[PDB]
Nucleic acid binder design. Structure first.
Ligand code: SF4
Ligand code: NA
Length: 344
DNA sequence: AAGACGTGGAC
DNA sequence: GTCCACGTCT
């Protein structure tokens, strides 16, 4: 019944489509950036980041040529920072290998870092009209209600089932519009809770509504880590930071020196981490910071720093007015904030 | 397969 | 407290 379905979905879309910033044009670069930013991140949160990011890096080439530190800083606070290291890498490769043109072949484009099945579909259909599915969580939710698919939406193969369904119902005339429309329906009408089935423009075609189970779809099925953080300052008030490893948690961001302590043993694991002279005073605060897959229980220890050799390794001696120029995870921004108000 | 990988806001 | 939030790499 796809031909009817298309027109009713596309009609609704033409009326209800939000004028979001990345919807101003179909520049493949602007689309790509916005899709990367929208991964596991709400639209309202993304809007200001996208505007500043495009301000700072207006073209794919501008992004490619920026220092990675300048690119992390722009992403500071968005979460899932490797999304941006991959985008930065993929863009550099588009500039050098594809002459600054986002490739329109699905196979070539998917080879770029951070680009998976969803982003292939999203970017190529909207920028170039390539008829590839663009199944995200919204689409998965819509399709699961529309076709009463009770497969655990977390299973790897489940998406592949949804992608097949898109290939056979999609408006091959206008794939971008169609894909866009399906996503917008998930966002505006067919929502995680209390979907507005009474208002929905494809309600006639929907098995979950007919069966009375829209609400129960889709079907879908964390460790605590103590952290001791050191805030060490000069008599000149310069502060000691360090750049995290290029791999693992919060890759490449800056932080106040810290280590995992396993419980509340002491402030010695901290002081020991030498390699220059430090003595630490009583801790001033403890608060916790949540990630998707773990929770840091931080305890910050103010302390005095004395110089006994060069600062190297990933460590850097930062004057206070310059902290603002580095990218810190939110947890460490709070470390600085609590330390500063304590200093009152 | 299924875990690593940030964050904020509705409820 | 839970869910959003399959997105992608591993
Ligand atoms: S009818 Fe209700 S459930 Fe079916 S698609 Fe429209 S909103 Fe989703
Ligand atoms: Na890829």
């Amino acid at each position: 019944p796809a031909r009817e379905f298309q027109r009713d979905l596309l009609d609704w879309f033409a009326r209800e489509r939000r004028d979001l910033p990345w919807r101003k044009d179909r520049d493949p670069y602007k689309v790509w950036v916005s899709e990367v930013m929208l991964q596991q991140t709400r639209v309202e949160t993304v809007i200001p980041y996208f505007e500043q990011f495009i301000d700072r890096f207006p073209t794919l080439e501008a992004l490619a040529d920026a220092d990675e530190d300048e690119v992390l800083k722009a992403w500071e606070g968005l979460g899932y920072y490797s999304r941006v290291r991959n985008l930065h890498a993929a863009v550099k490769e588009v500039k050098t290998r594809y002459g600054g043109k986002v490739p329109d072949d699905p196979d070539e484009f998917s080879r770029l870092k951070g680009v998976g099945p969803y982003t292939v579909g999203a970017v190529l259909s909207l920028a170039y009209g390539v008829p590839e599915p663009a199944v995200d969580g919204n689409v998965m939710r819509v399709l699961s209600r529309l076709f009463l698919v009770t497969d655990d939406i977390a299973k790897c193969s489940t998406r592949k089932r949804f992608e097949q369904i898109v290939r056979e119902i999609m408006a091959y005339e206008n794939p971008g519009a169609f894909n866009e429309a399906l996503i917008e329906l998930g966002a505006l009408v067919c929502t995680p809770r209390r979907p507005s089935c009474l208002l929905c423009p494809v309600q006639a075609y929907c098995q979950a509504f007919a069966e009375g189970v829209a609400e129960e779809l889709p079907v879908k099925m964390v460790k605590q880590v103590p952290l001791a953080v050191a805030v060490l300052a000069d008599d000149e008030g310069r502060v000691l930071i360090r750049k995290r490893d290029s791999t693992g948690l919060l890759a490449n961001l800056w932080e106040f020196p810290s280590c995992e302590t396993d419980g509340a043993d002491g402030k010695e694991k901290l002081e020991q981490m030498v390699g220059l002279q430090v003595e630490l005073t009583e801790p001033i605060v403890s608060f916790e910071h949540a990630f998707s897959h773990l929770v840091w229980q931080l305890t910050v220890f103010p302390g005095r720093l004395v110089h006994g050799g060069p600062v190297e390794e990933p460590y850097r001696l930062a004057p206070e007015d310059e902290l603002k120029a580095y990218a810190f995870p939110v947890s460490h921004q709070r470390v600085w904030r609590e330390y500063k108000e304590w200093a009152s």
